[model samples]
Target: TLTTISGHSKDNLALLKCLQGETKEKEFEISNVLPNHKMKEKLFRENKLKIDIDIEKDIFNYSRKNIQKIEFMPVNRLISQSEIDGIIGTLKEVLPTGQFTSGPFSKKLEEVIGDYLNKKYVIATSSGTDALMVSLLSIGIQPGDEVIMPANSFAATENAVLAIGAKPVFVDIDHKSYCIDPLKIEEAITQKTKCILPVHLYGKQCDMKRIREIADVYQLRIIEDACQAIGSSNLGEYGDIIILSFNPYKNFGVCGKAGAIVTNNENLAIRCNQYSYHGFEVDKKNKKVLDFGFNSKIDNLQAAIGLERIKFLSYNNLKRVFLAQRYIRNLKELEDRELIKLPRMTEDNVWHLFPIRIINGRRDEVKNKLYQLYNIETDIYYPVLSHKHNTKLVKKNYMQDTLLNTEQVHKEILHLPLHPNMLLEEQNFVLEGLINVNK
Candidate 1:
């Protein structure tokens, strides 16, 4: 069973108190990084050998003097006791399956999520990053090809494009949605342009209808990076190829890494399936290698958890929408006063992150005070642009110096802790924190 550390566990209480009092003035050595999947991934993808993560922050200081309890987003409070037992039971049943990778449980996850998204087949993969790389390869994106995407996302969108040996042509985003600017797409296209990968960042939709039209004009394929968007407020469908992730923080999150590619096109599905399977069509007796592929298969255990969670996606997402409305309602004064900019939702969005932008130059200052005053630790989505010099490209030199809107907004935005797992008390604290911010 999953245990909640009720601010009573000696280690947690001591650490929490310690985090509030001390400032770390040390750096971690490269060799100090553990051999865990998450640690290794953070080191490599961010390409940082040395890390100076400041531990003296708000993720440490919430206190209810009466009971000394707090529920946090970065904490694993999403999974219920039932869900935990369900996962354990599912593992017990499927643990002995023959060829355990992408077995019955995984296939079942694909079917369930595919039905939910209204796609014919959902090709499950090892992670959101793998789903992206597999989808690019499945679409036949090769070396020297170009994929256009927005800059204000987690590095996965651009990194995937580069992993497939394609140049990621950068573009500005809609200042409101923080998604691809459809108006900017055509201008970034070239003779080598093969795809437009628009991410539905923060569970918000992009200008997909317009993007599809632009793709048709240039004869380019559309790859919807819907990793953050599982269900649209109303319209579930998005593009030619759609991506979904089961990262631990999502509404339909699993206990560990998992993701899927959804498409109605049968031929594309075949390619994705083949490409995921080591480029070989495998049967009980057959394994024919057609080309190169990666070992990016989501195991049955992760899939089983996904299958369990899909049953509750609609319910959870609805709760998320309500929570988001609460945030907007409480923070509307800040928006009205022009102190902060909340996300502009054209349609009903799947409210993944309640990220608000401090319009003035006090974003970092306000963020620090939110933590210090209210124990609210919010995240800055992207501290730097993806096309900058530190970011390497598969085909170099497509980086732009002038994505004015993207560069400008990234500095001001801060993601408030918003999740379905959030307690009402915790949410009220966040609202209190927002109101407490000085312009």
Candidate 2:
């Protein structure tokens, strides 16, 4: 018997359903009662609360107000101080053993990540950059081999290729999705090309279905750089290998820098394991397996932190999706007026960065006005396209006209403040700021 439940709203009804305990649902939709699983999980654990009165009091009381200032990414907002305190408390439990580098925690982290990706083999590394380098090496990317990739990602995407003395053949991105264009990949292939490294830039999954078709036709390996797309649906299914990052800024971050290589190939996994840890055989006493390798395995401390942080990954990703959908829905009028263009809420996007294109060459002015007039902070995720960097490597290897779409999109792109910890009221302020400027 339900007692004194005041409202018949969606949340209240969902609460009632949860109380009945007959519905065989793993999760239910209740936007206000967040994390969404807390109630059900608590009920399962405790069996009965004051049955109604005790549970809903804490989460239900809140007041909305206008937020005047919005920062691009605040550290406290990315991760709560309480979570960090808990992470340190967990780390204190491991300090007695002195197994800091390659230890039990790293192994557990790898297993947890494997379960998340439905992958059997995962090699956790010190950084996403090292993850890229090690995965490339495991697949046998030799000197002077060409790795076809887009020119519009973070520098690490191209830097990994260059570190191994391999050439990165910059391909153009699709104008709409901001990922590498599968249609344009064929033209970039040559006798020197060895692999296709498709970055899931800005958390938008590359069209791996089509990229795989292209890879099969040309007999090239595919390495999915999914650093920003960790929780994306059906991620890592199409590529031979997948890369993920866990830096503090990434969607699924540990307190410090960390990353992993995910693959189904046992041999590649073994090689990656060796390559990421100074060429030593795993679990052996410093036995050399390869002639050389980088010392890039993630530290045990960070792995411990990762194990704790991953508990929130699913919920954080959902929050990001909710915020992104709000942006697209609220900013439709500006898009219709040709003042801005918003990223689509595609099935594969994890909404790592909420990007929009400023129309009519007013990108800079709008960005400036947003900051000056509204106390809002926005950024261009990658200010320089990979090929546009004025380096000797760019002059010697890449031609100017090859990456036209990548160059065009780079000019108009702006990333608004969006993260898991953003309050709904804060996002409404962002929406209002954008609307005020465009109107």
Candidate 3:
């Protein structure tokens, strides 16, 4: 009734193809079959009876003493207690001055970030979304203009375009890099196309060289969304401007939300400055220079916290890279066997989130099983694709647009637990769970 065939190639897809015509009616469970394979999908589609039995009791014997819950991103574990004390000391000094909103700390933060980014100006905003909105508006993106971007990023990418009454043209992403494909960008362009807003998703830099060439040909402005890619290589090199985030979860984060718009163009910098706070001229309280603007400037309290936390950014980033390399090394076998896909290590990546693809289309099952079996937490960063949302834009205009690669990869993408604050033992436990569970 049961036959455990051994000596098959570890590559389940290859083994499945080799045994295509030899499958029997009773049972043909391979001893080292992958978690899920095309053969399993075929059997399910044909309505054939399938049963699974756990045979490796020794391997699956998860011990309580060796297991501890791994968190995806916990607020309590984000910052060290020493950092908290430093922030408190800064707050005490600022509170005595009673300059909470517009104070000296904001300028200090802007100077520090501007120096780090090697840009001439930095307009710190209340949040990264505000930084994006301000950058788009300052770049002369008016109503009815089309902005080309990939659909796989967070909603803020498109929401920034929508908030200003501009049309967001969603393009498919590259199969490997998971960023906007420069080849497909031209096809999405139109007379209404005004800007090329490329997002540096998952802490990896986009192909800015290619994007820059295309933009030069089209005479378009480039807005680099470096929210997840602050310390990445050539961050603002090929773009007119760039944006950064300082939310508590980012690589460089403060106690509260903060962000900045970086640029070398003095005119654009002034426009962003005015647009960031009520359209007033620099150093003017209530004078309006532009038509209108949002109250989006970063507050002094958070800026002070940012000044403190930025000191540890380099060290924390290094830790994240080390963890990412460990994941890649440990999971190489799964990737080679074609059961999963790992992110390529490149100099441009800051290792914000370690993303992997569960190639068998069982990404959900794998994620849930990791949590249920080993208490190892993971996440699908952006569960919903931008263009796929059930909103008015999708129903009315973008209903027929198809993103083949974006849709295909979205089904298999999974993010493992990776944070600078996580313990090495915790990461090892995660790796152990992933290897055993995928068997």
Candidate 4:
């Protein structure tokens, strides 16, 4: 028998509790429901947070100026709300089936990405690090082996290699492009060198034509860390495997952490799938049981977001391209004075980061003044060199030849407010701060 149904007055979670019987003392065979609409549920989730993102620049209906501030990679409100509503509604129907992952959404994601990149197989993973971890172990990165890569990269790159007993050989980045210099690669390789992990940092294309020649001469494999360089017209088509990241800040970001590995090898794919599925051993009955492995499957909700975002991938990227050009145009005068160094414009570069090298060693001086003056924030992209993360790690272990450039640039680089959701006001404010900071 059904008795009383009352609405809670506190909050949505409390409303959820009202339905879920958080404090109810009576119980009966029941499936009483006061479900939130799918659209409302999604809107609540996106807007309910403690992040300091100011939405005055974002919304026409909503504008306030007290906390008016620019944030890095603000939540992507550019994605169509109608489209998001559709995506959430679709997921609402099938999410409870426990097919929360490894379902149709994952397959759709793989298909869209694979077809776009022209790769035969694409395996989506839980996060960029897991993709690297699985890609390394699957391709037979053995214990006591070494993988050569530039020292100027995110910690994820080092963690992926170091987590598996393999060593990371840190090389220096070329000044022109913040990517691994191919000329410096050969000198770092040794008898234990099995692979070259060239990171396409900041969407600047590496000199792959030379890296390929070096890889062939050394008989080494290649795994491109294209996490930040997706669709730059410079990644893939050269490595044994290529990896992509969908972290919220990335160009093709999903709702959360998501990534993929694109490869053409079948045996490698099979072994990697086993690793991704948690190292299942084939029993006498040929069944999958958790005999061994790691859990790195992409969830359905993330995949749904990925699927929706793919359709708008090129559209959003074009916006970034235009914004980056605007940065270059507005900041060129400073570059000429040798006070800061701007990137060389190239057809393939996507300007994932607009970095300037403060050659006068006023990196911190310039950074603080800008914030204090305009309340506009900026970040240093690779302030800490990966190898120098622990001097202890360098005291005995870790691989490298010489890092003259990487070490020097670590002290001088600054990434201005060139991240996502940069509207007219924020962009003009950033330019205003930079141009006036010299005063």
TM-score of each: 0.80, 0.88, 0.84, 0.80
| Stretches of model 2 off by over 4 angstroms after superposition | 1-62
Compared with the true structure, the alpha-carbon lDDT of candidate 2 equals 0.81
Worst 10 residues of 1 by lDDT: 1-10
Off-target runs (Cα >4 Å) in candidate 3 are: 1-66
Root mean square deviation (Cα) for candidate 1: 14.3
What lDDT score goes with residue 31 in model 4? Answer: 14
Q: List the residue pairs that clash in candidate 1.
A: none
Q: How many backbone clashes does candidate 4 have?
A: 3
Write one digit per residue (lDDT tens) for candidate 2, span 113-218: 8866779899999999999999999999999999999888899999999999998988888878999999999999999999999999988888899999999999
| Model 3 C-alpha lDDT per residue in residues 149-189, reported as the tens digit of each score | 99888888889999999999989999788899998998888
User: For residues 369-399, what per-residue lDDT tens digits would candidate 1 score against the true structure?
Assistant: 8777666777786776787646344125744
Better of 2 and 4 by TM-score: 2
Each model's lDDT comes to 0.70, 0.81, 0.80, 0.70
Q: Specify the highest-TM-score model's number.
A: 2
Instruction: Please estimate how well model 1 matches the true structure, expressed as its whole-model Cα lDDT.
Output: 0.70
Residue range 315-345, candidate 4, lDDT tens digits: 3454455566667888889888778888765
Clashing pairs in 4: 278-293, 279-292, 279-293
- By lDDT, rank the candidates, best first: 2, 3, 4, 1
Against the true structure, candidate 1 reaches a TM-score of: 0.80
Sort the predicted structures by TM-score, highest score first: 2, 3, 1, 4
Error of 4 at 186 (Å): 0.5
